[PDB]
Structures are given as structure tokens and as C-alpha cells.
Design goal:
It is classed as ribosome. The structure is cut from a larger assembly and holds chains A (60 residues) and B (100 residues). Chain A contains 2 helices and no strands. With 60 residues, chain A is mostly helical. Chain A has one domain. Classes of the chains: A mainly alpha (60), B mainly beta (100). Chain B binds 2 RNA strands through strand 4 and strand 6.
Chain lengths: 60, 100
RNA sequence: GAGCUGUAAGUAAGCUUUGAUCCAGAGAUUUCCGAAUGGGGAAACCCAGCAUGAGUUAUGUCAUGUUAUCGAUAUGUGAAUACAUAGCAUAUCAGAAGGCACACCCGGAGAACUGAAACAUCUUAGUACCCGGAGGAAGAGAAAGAAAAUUCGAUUCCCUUAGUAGCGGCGAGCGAAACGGGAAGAGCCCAAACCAACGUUGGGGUUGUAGGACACUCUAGUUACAAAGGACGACAUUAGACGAAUCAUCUGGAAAGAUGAAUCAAAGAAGGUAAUAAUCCUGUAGUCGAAAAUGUUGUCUCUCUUGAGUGGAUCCUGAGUACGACGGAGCACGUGAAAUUCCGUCGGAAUCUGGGAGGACCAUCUCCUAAGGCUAAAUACUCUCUAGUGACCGAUAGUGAACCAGUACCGUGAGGGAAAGGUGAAAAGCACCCCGGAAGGGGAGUGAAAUAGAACCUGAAACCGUGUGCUUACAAGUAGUCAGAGCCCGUUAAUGGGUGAUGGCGUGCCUUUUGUAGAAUGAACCGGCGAGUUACGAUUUGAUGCAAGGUU
RNA sequence: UGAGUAGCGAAAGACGGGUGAGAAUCCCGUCCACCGAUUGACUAAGGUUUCCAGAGGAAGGCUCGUCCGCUCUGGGUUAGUCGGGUCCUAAGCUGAGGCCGACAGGCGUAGGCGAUGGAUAACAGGUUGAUAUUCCUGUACCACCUAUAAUCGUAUCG
């Protein structure tokens, strides 16, 4: 239900960098050491990346 | 079809005739839980420290084909239909045309 | 239209009436191996060439494109042969490849065991296996035919003809066709004579009741063959939505049962629901419904496109072909008196007064025009999809497999292959106490039932045990039978039941034999499974219908 | 059933002290005995986590078991030089174009693939419950890249 591709294509590639590298990567470290609660936050960021890539390939 | 929050009357079973509110519904195997019927005795957590205090009793799920809806004007167990008078599909009684 | 994050319960963190999870249509993504195709290779791995780009003062390392072979058509195409056919060079094209239903269909190649009571001709059999090419069907197909009637008019398939004609060490055995009755049923394009053009394009022209070229006046598209591209409306497939009618009282843990009164039906199919439901729940009869994609079928559009009589002084109508001898094969037909069709070798015709066929061959008389090429329907089959049926199986059965099976397991390998379903309506899966290190038990609780406690429905026999009523330590035993004291119990109630001191008579069972206690064979014991069947023909009996008729 | 019958797979063990419900069999100590061109120390093939630590005693171990190559839960393989590839080739295998053959296919030139051989830069110590030419210390060598100097230039690369 929550779509995050209302923006243009210029700021779009900036979101795939911020969502994956600074957000999805940090949550995997805190899970390994045993410091992260709210484990459902991982599946949310995984879909935010996929929704961004679907619209990018769709615009062609 | 029985949703969560109605006022049904039990038709068959060891606790038939009584009336209660449907608090939970298990639509996969078509089971409903009615507040006041099917009490079970459960020896909870032998090894686990609740801290345990004895035997606890809650309600057990009853089959959906044993409870029936009630009528707002006559208070009797009736079937249901669909009049479709509203844009959304409404549910009406069988003994009368009022909404359930 | 309110819950949900599979089997699979747990503990966690979250999403959802601002429409989650789910059910259909169309899209995006799609690591590596595999025809695997840049090179290599022990499949799922290793090592590279070019083109920009990311990173560095710089080399190393990454990312995305691209580079196999053969074939076909363009261009450089300048060899040993001077001029020029070979080699080479690069650029193009949903060009080819490799799979699956070991079913069906054409073609190449091609056994044996077996039957003949041996065996070689023959049969099994052009069957099994292997190989190639396909298709949704394939193959066949528009008379050089079948016939003998005053004729029929492409092919294929089903009944009958008929176990007849015939073939056959005339042995075993093999085995037709036409006529007739039905399903289905449109037929057309090339070569040549000829006419304008440069061996070549187009017109022209396609046959046996003889056709065309030539001469004289003149006048419907069937895109499934027939030449082949496109915008062109109604159903149909792929998700679904409504959908009539019952209440009470007894027994029970529980009603749908029984006993009472009632009500629906174009709906009394079926399944579930604490037990057996037309009216409790999914449904059924009957109506309605499609964004989007794919089908089947149309009305117009678009693309093709002048129809017939008269005409032989002169031309055309398929050549190393038809056919013959020789060696084989195929037609029911084994070389026989073998016609009619094919293959290899070598000879080798005729040109409408023509040529072929009518079971050697000749004559007459009839029917038909070989040597180029296409063609839908009735037919065969099922790895599948969807909706249903059974005097079919019910866990040693039914597929090898109801089960996480082609899996444990067994072989270097090709390959071979099992065993294993059931607690209860509902986990409500035994809190707590006692012995014990545990395991397992004794109570208390849950439940209608716990000798229903997950090694969980019912629980047979072999076999292993614990008690007791009669009897047995001087006796020679296929272990029973008939007679019979004593002792001990009391029946489906009758000329009763259990035990057996002592006396008579008595060498198991089945196979196979002139003959078996046999020292002839088979069985350790118990349970389950385990062998004259069905289809099509013939003959003889009983029954039933009709009768010089009977029956499809 | 045979039946509480055969067997329990070459060999020297004894005692004291611990652990624990339970010890001829596990742990520690002492004495005694066996092998020692090997019953010791390294490695190739092959096996594929059997290696280490803390827990467990139902089944497996031909007895017992508190123990284990068994069970459960967490861990453990570090390379420019050591072995193999980015190097070379034997036998053999495969082979563009070609030759042959009812099909399938067979043979073979150029060219490839292929070590058990030829070439090729590192040696001493320390350290952990499990790794060492690999990690850490000490001193070296080799292929390449860039930036500065001797010196150029008929140098120079083939």
C-alpha cells in the first residue's frame, strides 16, 4: 500500500542509495551482534528497494 | 455469515439455548468462540513458571453451524439474506426485512 | 470484504475498512550449469581478446556490451594457369541445431526362441530392437480404373461377400477382391504447340461423349488446395454474485434418531455439522456477471477476375521413358501357364490410321489416356486441461509408491528396490503429591469413556507366564476310543458338566504306486495371500417366440 | 525348539588415592611388563568433519561403563615464494577443412587437450583447547608500476 516513487528519476537513484546502503546494511549488523529489536523493520526496507527498482525499469 | 461482534444463540450442543457475543472467529476451519460456552479445564505450563497457580479455564471454539443470528425486533434465531438496497451489500433478516 | 505472515504448532516484531492475506488477466525481475555457442574442462568450474566507463600519482582488481560452427545472399575477391574458377577478409538475416507422450503415422534396415509333435522350403514376421523425417493427425487421392448390366464415375474408413475363390514339403498354415448397404463428399494448377520481349520474364493454354494451338462474327473474391497482405460484430474460455422452506418434547456426553404437530419444491444431487438432516452450514434447480487476454464465427470493405459454339490442308499432348532378357522383391498368390506394380545391370519403341488395360498369348469387340505437381471431411491415438460415471479396489488390496518414494538400501557401472495409514466431538496432551539419579510407576484431576495417554479404534492364533478343582514316583505309551469306580461342581435343563484308579481294541496325514507304519516324497508352528478364466467361432442339450417361413 | 548351549576375534598386569545412585573396566600417581629397519616420527592416494571444548548415558561398543571415532549444543583450516592453474610437452584422447560409409557413424592434417617428467622467488625461532615455510617477531629475495639522478641517441626492442 505504501509507495515511495512519487518523485522524479533524478532523486530516484538517490533513494536506492540511501535505502540500501545506509539503512538495510546497518540493520543486518545490529542483528548479528544481537543489538536490534523490531526485526520487522528489515522486511519493510527490502520492499522499499524493490518498489523503487520496478518503477525505474518500467519508465525505460 | 458470522463475523466478530454479533449476538448469536446456540442451537445444538451441551450449552444450547444460551446466548453470547462472538469474540473470535477461525474462518480457516470455520470455528467461532462465543463468550460463555464450552469451558475447558487446562493444566497450564507444568515446566514453565507463570508462576503457576493451578487450573485455568477459558472458552473453547464452537462450530459455526451451531449458532444463529438474532432479530432486532422479535429476538428470535433467524437466517439472513442480502437486499442490496445500499451501495454496500447489506445483510437482512429472514422473518423481517430489517437489517441485522 | 476482516482478518492474516505455507506445511508447522512455538516465541518475537509488525501489516490491515485510507480495503491486508487471498482468487483470475496482462507486465517487470529472472544468479550458475545444460544444444551451451570466446578458449578449455572431471556439468553447475577455471582462464582470456576488443569497445567506452568506475577506482588509483600509477600498475593490480571490478561493471556492462561483444567474440562458436555450418548454411544463404551482398562486397574486398589481384592462385600454382598469364587473364581467371580455388584459398582468405569483414559486414548482414526470431536461417539451422537440442528436447518431450518410449501413444498414434510414413520410410530405411531387419532376428531368434516357437509351430510343423525331428528339420532345411514354410511358419513365428516384415513382429521385437535400432535409425531418419514429420503432423495434429499422417498416408492415400481427381481413372492409361472397376465391369460385361439397356452400366457405374477421385481417395479413406465401417458391415456383408467369407473362412468363399485361391496359395501351400497342396504338409503346418496363410487368405482376397468386385457387387451391394452406410458415414463423409469441392476439385484444380504446370510441360509443350503459340504470341510480344531479353537458354530466358509475361500472356496463352490443360483433355478421351478427343482437347488445345491456329482460323471466322461475338460477347463471380471461395485466403483449407484453387495467387495471396490488412482495419472489419455476436457468441465462447479464463475470476465470481444472488438463490425457497422447522419448531417442540423424551433417551444421551452430544439429535440429524424416536414420538408430535408444521412448511417448501423447475431445489428429495452430494458433502459437512459432537449420532441417521429436503427446511443448521457449504450447495443444488433456475437467473445474472467481464476491466484485460485468448478463441470460434459472421455483414460490409480490401486483393484478385470477360464467358461459350463452330475449328484437323498444317502443329502440340511428358524418352534413355514405356517395354524385353538376366538376378531379386512386392501383390492372399512359394517362378508356377503369372497377368497387373518396383529395384540393380544391359539392350531399347510408337507419335490419334497413336498408345495402354480386360490373369500366358493372338484376333475381334468394349472401357480408359502412363512416364510433372497440389488437395479439406468421415479415420487412429492420449504425457495433459476441465466437468462426470462404476453390480471397480479398500492398506499382503488398488499404480513400485494413500506415506515427504524411484526415496532408505544394494552394484565400478548400465541397472535393480522396499518397509511405514486410524487417540478424541473438541488437546480439553495428566496442575499438584509420593518412591526413584533417571526411565517407569501409585494416587489425584481432564473426558461420555485413560485396559482411548501420541509404541494411542477394535485386539484373533502361535508363544511366554502367575493361581487353583481332580490326578500322577514298579511303569513298555500314533497318546485316542468303548466299558468303569472314586472325588469335585451345578447347565441353553437333559437318558447333566470336569477329572480318570483299572480292563478291551488300535503302527499319523498327504502325494506316488502291483504294493507304503514305512527306513519312498512334502510339511518347525500360527495368521494372511495363493490355481479351468474371459472374448470370438463350431457342435450338441433345456427353455421361449413365430412357422414354409424365421431374422436383421 | 536346539539352550541358558557354542562363542565373546593373536598379547601382563598390580595397588593406593579421587569422581559418582552404581567402578576389575573412567581420571590421577607409583611399580611392573611389550615394540623399537618399528606397535615411533613425516607424507601421496582414499575417506569427508571422524578434529577441539563444555554437557548426556536410551540405542550402538560382543561384558561393564560416570567413558568414547556414539548423542546434544557451540567452535576450529589464514600463503607473491610450499603443491596445482594464469608456463612446456610423452603415451593417449579429440580434431576446422578433408577421405570413407544403408543410416547412426568410422578415420585423419593443421591446431588443441593432457604429468607419473622438464622449468620456477623463504629460511630460522615464538605462540593456541583445535591452524603454521600460511599468524606474530628477525633478516632476505622476486615479477611489475610510478616519481627523481649517473649517462644520452646507432643508444634501445626483436
Amino acid at each position: 500500500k505504501a509507495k515511495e516513487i512519487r518523485n522524479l528519476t533524478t532523486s530516484e537513484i538517490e533513494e536506492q542509495i540511501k535505502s540500501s546502503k545506509e539503512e538495510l546494511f546497518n540493520l543486518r549488523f545490529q542483528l548479528a551482534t544481537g543489538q536490534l529489536e523490531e526485526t520487522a523493520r528489515i522486511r519493510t526496507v527490502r520492499k522499499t528497494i524493490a518498489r523503487l527498482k520496478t518503477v525505474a525499469r518500467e519508465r525505460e | 455469515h458470522i463475523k466478530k461482534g454479533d449476538n448469536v444463540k446456540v442451537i445444538a450442543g451441551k450449552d444450547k439455548g444460551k446466548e453470547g457475543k462472538v469474540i473470535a472467529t477461525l474462518p480457516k476451519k470455520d470455528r467461532v468462540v462465543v463468550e460463555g460456552v464450552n469451558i475447558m479445564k487446562k493444566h497450564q505450563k507444568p515446566t514453565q513458571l507463570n508462576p503457576e497457580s493451578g487450573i485455568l479455564e477459558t472458552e473453547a471454539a464452537i462450530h459455526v453451524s451451531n449458532v444463529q443470528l438474532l432479530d432486532p425486533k422479535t429476538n428470535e434465531p433467524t437466517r439472513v439474506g442480502y437486499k442490496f438496497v445500499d451501495g454496500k451489500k447489506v445483510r437482512i433478516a429472514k422473518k423481517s426485512g430489517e437489517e441485522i
